[PDB]
């Protein structure tokens, strides 16, 4: 039985069937001092207590958080729901389909593979910026999206009918996290007579954005999301919780982008890897939900697991503003107050006992950008001309392009649209208002529109060759932009709506005009992309921009007008208004009270109702797609998009006792913070690449290749794209090249091809890496890929959260150097042969010895963090375990 059933009571005498687990009735004083994020974990456990998967001791361990956060103990977490996007959605539905096949083959019931909790899939990663600057670019971009992606869309639509509790938001709707904030989020579930907190895991590293609204949720890899969808609790070490105290008032010209950029730099310097961040202080109450979500969004960019903003009165008002039903609205607040998860940020006696406390004074926040190559390299707007000019002559790296001093004023004239332009170092060639990070915030969006209005009024313009775009996260933004009369002014400056999806933010930035590309490559120019996203690593925005800066939407427009980032806005005018002479950025920048006025009068409940009323049925191309009535998928042999994966090939019911890895070669010797885009690229498939050869052999031409993202349903392509990033720094070669050495023969080969040589001779493989291995995106192909390449272990100094879990879920051992030890300190060259002794009895985070062919040995920490993770390893992976659990 549930040993906590005596806690269940009516929330309201008048609607008596609707109960909740009243946590205050624990009569435990520890509860009221808990961080609010831990309180949600506590509720999830209490409601789910059965004594098999969620035990009574687990509840006691969570209540005792204050002590047990230091005892490295594991706790179950069952989230209320799952959210997916299309890039991770396809491979997730392919593995569900493959699990059905596998269950059936063991004589089980294929119907047991079905989501038991609600799952939402938003299709937002497919559309690209092919056309811009016109009223018709939206239709033309959506048309192209459908033509390119028809087969994957047919497969996803199939999935939504073949699996229970799968809702699809079709293409053209918006971006996963924005749609989540505005529409999908419940905040409080009302389910089978029970109220409980909304909480979630998403297959996207930025799922943390929902934490701004007070829903506990974070990114997991696809295989973890599948386990969760099948009823399996996440197993996690009980986290420490950093309290982040916000104080004072931000300056009236400060955007929420300035704040998040400041917080990123700061939290990256405190180091919060493996930890929860909870916000509190007087400052939080002044921040709108949109502002909170922006801070919570960039959570993976500063390394925290979650960035939680407890539900308060600002949250309630956001729910009424976005047109949540008044029926729901009554019990949402009333429940949170009764259970003790309703916050008052202006009450210091309500503050939890945090692990420790880091502060930020909001008046110290200045207008700023991040770049040119990392999200944490925050640079003030006042200092942008000086910083970029320093970057020009500086040693190549995160803050250098080392262009020779005599070449600092290189430029190239070009002809676009029959007129002559000049391009120089620092010239803006992409100016994109993208990203759910900022388009969910009417303050920066209307701020940008009012800046545009005042700029057109002052006679300013954006030169026609600049790739300017607006990619809103929902139809709601287009609606209020038009309603406020601000849209025609954004149109004029080249910021017509180009589509609803990730687009520039994820790297789907489209082509640049050919004369512009020839100017950049001819004069070796450092061309600049300015964007309102959260990621600016030197691969990911556009192949032709060497510098990319994160900036608030109004700054995006300002730099587009300027045409360059080599400007000192306070000293040099943007243009001359014939009449009233010189016009500075100061003169056209709107304050937070002109914006707030426009926001109160145009961002209204009726607008959200109309946009989301028809959300699922409005797409006529989607509605028209034919899908089979099948419950088991008919794998088409002709398909280059959907392929039955090899993972569960020859799966047995009985467990295999895991063997030592004997004499492995090092396939790759990698450095610090190798990202999941290096391990598993999502964009362009290069002409000289193994994936390109596989595709050419199936009759495809380069323009049909599509992205690596779109092919995540085809393991053959995805394996060939593993470590296929053109900027991969393999320390075997000491240059940027997606290649390695096949050590027995000495030949340099593309990484897939070297792996195949090793595999065919039956040789096991490992990877060596430095700090923060696997940073960024959540893609589980960063673990499946290496698994199919024959990689049995990784040895790194540290791992990022999601990636480590994905390695474990694929049966790869994540090994870690003992603190103070690494490849240089142990004298590893990467040329030795590695034996990893896996003992008969395993323990979380145990030390194992590593023997070398040279006779040398050392120790590494085996990074299975909990007992259930050890079980996943014993089973050869998380899904193999789930198949077995379902089969019997
Ligand atoms: S790629 Fe950008 S726009 Fe898309 S979900 Fe991620 S953060 Fe949001
Ligand atoms: Zn010249």
The DSSP secondary-structure symbol of 590 reads: P
Binding site, annotated residues for substrate: 85, 204-206, 535, 540, 698, 778-779
Q: Within a 13 Å sphere around the CA of 148, how many CA atoms are in the beta-carbon half?
A: 21
Residue with tokens 């600057």: 133
Q: Is 534 in the pocket of ligand 1 (CB under 6 A)?
A: yes
Joined tokens for residue 249:
């008032």
Q: 228 and 248: one domain?
A: no
Binding site, annotated residues: 85, 204-206, 436, 502, 505, 535, 540, 698, 778-779
The DSSP secondary-structure symbol of 427 reads: B
Q: What is the CATH classification number for the domain harbouring 799?
A: 3.20.19.10
Q: What is the DSSP string of 775-827?
A: BS---THHHHHHHHTTEEEEEES-B-HHHHHHHHHTT-EEEEE-TT--TTTTT
Residue with tokens 């939890």: 352
Joined tokens for residue 766:
């490992």
Mark out the alpha helices in 180-302 (DSSP H runs): 222-229, 256-270, 282-286, 289-297
Question: Which residues partner with 835 through β-bridges?
Answer: 851
Determine the residue of 294, 437, 675 to mutate for testing ligand 1's pocket, defined as the one with the most ligand atoms within 8 A of the Cβ atom: 437
Q: Atom 8, ligand 1: which residue's CA is nearest?
A: 436
- Atom of ligand 1 at shortest range from CA of 506: 1
Q: 180 and 37: one domain?
A: yes
User: What distance in Å separates the CA atoms of residue 267 and residue 25, rounded to the nearest whole number?
Assistant: 36
Give distance in angstroms: CA of 414 to centre of ligand 2.
Answer: 11
Q: What is the CATH classification number for the domain harbouring 515?
A: 3.30.499.10
Joined tokens for residue 654:
């009985």
Query: Which residues does 191 contact at the CB level (< 8 Å), separation at least 6?
Result: none
**Ligand with the closest atom to the CA of 421:** 2
Give distance in angstroms: CA of 725 to centre of ligand 1.
Answer: 21
Asked which of 317, 349, 367 is the last residue of a domain, the reply is 367
Question: Which residues partner with 189 through β-bridges?
Answer: 196
- Atom of ligand 1 at shortest range from CA of 435: 3
> Cis (ω within 30 of 0) for the bond into 372?
yes
Q: Is 502 in the pocket of ligand 1 (CB under 6 A)?
A: yes
Mark out the alpha helices in 484-613 (DSSP H runs): 487-492, 514-522, 553-562, 585-588, 592-602, 605-613
Joined tokens for residue 669:
């010797």
Residue with tokens 């034996």: 835
User: What distance in Å separates the CA atoms of residue 589 and residue 558, rounded to the nearest whole number?
Assistant: 9
Binding site, annotated residues for [4Fe-4S] cluster: 436, 502, 505
**Ligand with the closest atom to the CA of 439:** 1
Query: For the chain, how many residues are written?
Result: 888
- Atom of ligand 1 at shortest range from CA of 178: 8
Q: 844 and 775: one domain?
A: yes
Q: 604 and 668: one domain?
A: no
CA 217 to chain CA mean position, Å? 12
- CB-based burial label for 623 (10 Å; 0-12, 13-18, 19+): exposed
Joined tokens for residue 623:
């509605």
Domain of residue 784: give its range. Answer: 654-888
Determine the residue of 88, 505, 776 to mutate for testing ligand 1's pocket, defined as the one with the most ligand atoms within 8 A of the Cβ atom: 505
Q: What is the CATH classification number for the domain harbouring 621?
A: 6.10.190.10
Mark out the alpha helices in 64-219 (DSSP H runs): 65-68, 86-105, 137-162, 176-179
User: What distance in Å separates the CA atoms of residue 815 and residue 819, rounded to the nearest whole number?
Assistant: 12
Determine the residue of 176, 205, 290 to mutate for testing ligand 1's pocket, defined as the one with the most ligand atoms within 8 A of the Cβ atom: 176
- Give yes or no for a contact between 328 and 41, defined as CB atoms under 8 angstroms apart: no
Q: What is the CATH classification number for the domain harbouring 248?
A: 3.40.1060.10
| Per-position b or e across 765-795, b if 16+ CB within 10 A of its CB | bbbbbbbbbbbbbbbbbbbbbbbbbbbbbbb
Nearest CA to 373 out of 783, 124, 127, 675 is that of 675
Q: SS3 for 279? A: strand
Query: Which residues does 738 contact at the CB level (< 8 Å), separation at least 6?
Result: 686, 689, 723, 724, 725, 726, 728, 750, 751
Tally of helices (H runs) and strands (E runs) in the chain: 31, 36
Asked which of 306, 333, 367 is the last residue of a domain, the reply is 367
Nearest CA to 388 out of 495, 284, 210, 525 is that of 525
Q: 576 and 613: one domain?
A: no
User: What distance in Å separates the CA atoms of residue 284 and residue 244, rounded to the nearest whole number?
Assistant: 10
Q: 713 and 805: one domain?
A: yes
**Ligand with the closest atom to the CA of 424:** 2
Q: How are beta strands 834-836 and 428-433 bridged, if at all?
A: unpaired
User: What distance in Å separates the CA atoms of residue 173 and residue 190, rounded to the nearest whole number?
Assistant: 26
Give distance in angstroms: CA of 411 to centre of ligand 2.
Answer: 6
Q: Is 435 in the pocket of ligand 1 (CB under 6 A)?
A: yes
**Ligand with the closest atom to the CA of 176:** 1
Nearest CA to 173 out of 491, 483, 614 is that of 614
Q: SS3 for 165? A: coil
Q: 830 and 864: one domain?
A: yes
User: What distance in Å separates the CA atoms of residue 339 and residue 557, rounded to the nearest whole number?
Assistant: 46
Asked which of 342, 367, 392 is the last residue of a domain, the reply is 367
Q: 268 and 314: one domain?
A: yes
- CB-based burial label for 105 (10 Å; 0-12, 13-18, 19+): middle
Q: Is 176 in the pocket of ligand 1 (CB under 6 A)?
A: yes
Taking phi over 0 as left and psi of -120 to 50 as alpha, with beta for the rest, 133 belongs to left
- Atom of ligand 1 at shortest range from CA of 434: 3
Give the number of domains in the chain. Answer: 5
- CB-based burial label for 405 (10 Å; 0-12, 13-18, 19+): exposed
Joined tokens for residue 886:
């379902």
Q: 519 and 422: one domain?
A: yes
The last residues before gaps in the chain (C-N over 2.5 Å) are none
Give phi and psi for 4, each to the nearest 5: -110, 10
Q: Atom 6, ligand 1: which residue's CA is nearest?
A: 206
Q: 732 and 773: one domain?
A: yes
**Ligand with the closest atom to the CA of 499:** 1
Q: Is 423 in the pocket of ligand 1 (CB under 6 A)?
A: no
Task: Give the Å distances, CA to CA, from 811 to 512, 601, 888.
Answer: 42, 55, 22
Q: Atom 1, ligand 1: which residue's CA is nearest?
A: 506
Joined tokens for residue 738:
């997606």
Q: 636 and 581: one domain?
A: no
> What kind of experiment solved this structure?
X-ray
Q: Is 810 in the pocket of ligand 1 (CB under 6 A)?
A: no
Give distance in angstroms: CA of 172 to centre of ligand 1.
Answer: 15
Joined tokens for residue 148:
């390119």
Q: 261 and 298: one domain?
A: yes
Resolution to 1 decimal, in Å?
2.5
Q: Atom 4, ligand 1: which residue's CA is nearest?
A: 502
């Amino acid at each position: 039985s549930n040993p906590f059933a005596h806690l269940a009571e009516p929330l309201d005498p008048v609607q008596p069937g609707k109960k909740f687990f009243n946590l205050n009735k624990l009569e435990d004083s520890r509860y009221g001092r808990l961080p609010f994020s831990i309180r949600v974990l506590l509720e999830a456990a209490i409601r789910n207590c059965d004594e098999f998967l969620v035990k009574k001791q687990d509840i006691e361990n969570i209540l005792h958080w204050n002590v047990t956060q230091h005892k490295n103990i594991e706790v179950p977490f069952k989230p209320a729901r799952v959210i997916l996007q299309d890039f991770t959605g396809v491979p997730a539905v392919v593995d569900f389909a493959a699990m059905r096949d596998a269950v059936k083959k063991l004589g089980g019931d294929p119907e047991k593979i079905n989501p038991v909790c609600p799952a939402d899939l938003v299709i937002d990663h497919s559309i690209q910026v092919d056309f811009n600057r016109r009223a018709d670019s939206l239709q033309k971009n959506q048309d192209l999206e459908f033509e390119r992606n028809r087969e994957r869309f047919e497969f996803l639509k199939w999935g939504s009918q073949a699996f229970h509790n799968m809702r699809i938001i079709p293409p053209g709707s918006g971006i996963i996290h924005q749609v989540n904030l505005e529409y999908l989020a419940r905040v409080v579930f009302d389910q089978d007579g029970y109220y409980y907190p909304d909480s979630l895991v998403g297959t996207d590293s930025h799922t943390t954005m929902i934490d701004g609204l007070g829903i506990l949720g974070w990114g997991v890899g696809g295989i973890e999301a599948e386990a969760v969808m099948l009823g399996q609790p996440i197993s996690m070490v009980l986290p420490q919780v950093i309290g982040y105290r916000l104080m004072g008032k931000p300056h009236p010209l400060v955007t929420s982008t300035d704040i998040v950029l400041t917080i990123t730099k700061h939290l990256r310097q405190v180091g919060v890897v493996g930890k929860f961040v909870e916000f509190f202080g007087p400052g939080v109450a002044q921040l709108s939900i949109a502002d909170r979500a922006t801070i919570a969004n960039m959570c993976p960019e500063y390394g925290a697991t979650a960035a939680f903003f407890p539900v308060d009165e600002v949250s309630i008002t956001y729910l009424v503003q976005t047109g949540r039903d008044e029926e729901k609205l009554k019990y949402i607040k009333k429940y949170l107050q009764a259970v003790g998860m309703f916050r008052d940020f202006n009450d210091p006696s309500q503050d939890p006992d945090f692990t420790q406390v880091v502060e930020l004074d909001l008046k110290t926040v200045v207008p700023c950008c991040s770049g040119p190559k990392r999200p944490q390299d925050k640079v003030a707007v006042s200092d942008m001309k000086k910083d970029f000019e320093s970057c020009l002559g500086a040693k190549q790296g995160f803050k250098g392009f080392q262009v020779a001093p005599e070449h600092h004023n290189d430029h190239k004239t070009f002809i676009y649209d029959n007129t002559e332009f000049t391009l120089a170092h620092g010239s803006v060639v992409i100016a994109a208002i993208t990203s759910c990070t900022n388009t969910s915030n009417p303050s920066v969006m209307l701020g940008a529109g009012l800046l545009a209005k005042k700029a057109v009024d002052a006679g300013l313009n954006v030169m026609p060759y600049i790739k300017t775009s607006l990619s809103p996260g929902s139809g709601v933004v287009t609606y209020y932009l038009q309603e406020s009369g601000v849209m025609p002014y954004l149109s004029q400056l080249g910021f017509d709506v180009v589509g609803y999806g990730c687009m520039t933010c994820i790297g789907n930035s489209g082509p640049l005009p050919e004369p512009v590309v020839e100017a950049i490559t001819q004069g070796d120019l450092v061309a600049v992309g300015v964007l309102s996203g959260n990621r600016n690593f030197e691969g990911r925005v556009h192949p032709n921009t060497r510098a990319n800066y994160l900036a608030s939407p109004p700054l995006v427009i300002a730099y587009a007008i300027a045409g360059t980032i080599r400007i000192d806005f306070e000293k040099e005018p943007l243009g001359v208004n014939a009449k009233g002479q010189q016009v500075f950025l100061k003169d056209i920048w709107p304050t937070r009270d002109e914006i707030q006025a426009v926001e109160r009068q145009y961002v209204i409940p009726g607008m959200f109702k109309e946009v989301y009323q028809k959300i699922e049925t409005v797409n006529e191309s989607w509605n028209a797609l034919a899908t089979p009535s099948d419950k088991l998928f008919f794998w088409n042999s002709k398909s280059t998009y959907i392929k039955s994966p090899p993972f569960f090939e020859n799966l047995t019911l009985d467990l295999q006792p895991p063997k030592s890895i004997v004499d492995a070669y090092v396939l790759l010797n990698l450095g610090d913070s190798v990202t999941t885009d290096h391990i598993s690229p999502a964009g362009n498939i290069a002409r000289n690449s193994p994936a390109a050869r596989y595709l050419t052999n199936r009759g495809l031409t380069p323009r049909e290749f599509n992205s690596y993202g779109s092919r995540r349903g085809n393991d053959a392509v995805m394996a060939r794209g593993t470590f296929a990033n053109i900027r991969l720094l393999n320390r075997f070669l000491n240059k940027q090249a997606p290649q390695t050495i096949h050590l027995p023969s000495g030949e340099i080969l593309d990484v897939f091809d070297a792996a195949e040589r090793y595999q065919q001779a039956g040789l096991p493989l490992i990877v060596l890496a430095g700090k923060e291995y696997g940073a960024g995106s959540s893609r589980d192909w960063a673990a499946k890929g290496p698994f199919l390449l024959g990689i049995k272990a990784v040895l790194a100094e540290s791992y990022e959260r999601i990636h480590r879990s994905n390695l474990v879920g694929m049966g790869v051992i994540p090994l870690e150097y003992l603190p103070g030890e690494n490849a240089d300190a142990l004298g590893l060259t990467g040329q030795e042969r590695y034996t990893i002794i896996i003992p008969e009895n395993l323990k979380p985070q145990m030390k194992v010895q590593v023997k070398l062919d040279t006779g040398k040995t050392f120790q590494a920490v085996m990074r299975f963090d909990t007992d259930v993770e050890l079980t996943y390893f014993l089973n050869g992976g998380i899904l193999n375990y789930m198949i077995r659990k379902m089969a019997k």
